[PDB]
Design a protein around this ligand. Structure first.
Ligand SMILES: CC(C)(C)NC(=O)[C@@H]1C[C@@H]2CCCC[C@@H]2CN1C[C@@H](O)[C@H](Cc1ccccc1)NC(=O)[C@H](CC(N)=O)NC(=O)c1ccc2ccccc2n1
Ligand SMILES: [Cl-]
Ligand SMILES: [Cl-]
Ligand SMILES: [Cl-]
Lengths: 99, 99
């Protein structure tokens, strides 16, 4: 699709069998999803943005569908206010910015 | 132009007579620039992101050139470590996300 930006670019994702809403975010390096159960071991990560830092759980090699497009990659889990699809997965779905 | 997302989508902007680097940020509602003076009136605002909230100054009707494309809108000024061009100005330059 071609997504304009008059509204937030929210899409459906599927992760852990579950549908969620998430924001397609070119400003985010990483993908951050609200607290949920994911399989396997996790590693620590500290992320930062506009109001400071957040500790998250880093899970690697997670299967995730984004607006119908399949990705397999790193998902950070933590108390984020919005599920964010960052560039690590935007690149897997072939997304670009155009003007 | 078409901008891929392997790296942060940074572009040159001109604001307040100054050249700066800024991030094209589809996940940001607002445009937020590091501390600088701008003409005219302003009012305080609190904006949210990962980590909580940041206090900023809100300046309206500010012209900005973004990668060569003129736009006008609200610009927030505060202690951001990265200048961000959010949707309020991305729309004005005709930016879309494509996949
Ligand atoms: C997600 C993470 C990997 C931590 N990356 C970032 O957060 C980087 C950090 C960079 C350095 C600091 C300055 C911002 C830039 C860009 N951000 C990405 C950037 O796209 C970021 C992602 C985001 C969206 C929604 C909620 C939280 C976080 N957006 C923002 O910080 C913008 C700022 C604004 N008010 O316009 N936030 C929002 O547009 C926004 C929208 C809805 C919300 C609901 C509840 C609480 C907060 C909400 N914030
Ligand atoms: Cl990844
Ligand atoms: Cl505006
Ligand atoms: Cl349009």
């Amino acid at each position: 699709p071609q997504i304009t930006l008059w509204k937030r670019p929210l899409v459906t994702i599927k992760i852990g069998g579950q549908l969620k809403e998430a924001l397609l975010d070119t400003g985010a390096d990483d993908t951050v999803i609200e607290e949920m159960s994911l399989p396997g071991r996790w590693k620590p990560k500290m992320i930062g943005g506009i109001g400071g830092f957040m500790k998250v759980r880093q899970y690697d090699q997670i299967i995730i569908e984004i607006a119908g497009h399949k990705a397999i990659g790193t998902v950070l889990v933590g108390p984020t206010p919005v599920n964010i699809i960052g560039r690590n997965l935007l690149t897997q779905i072939g997304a670009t910015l155009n003007f």
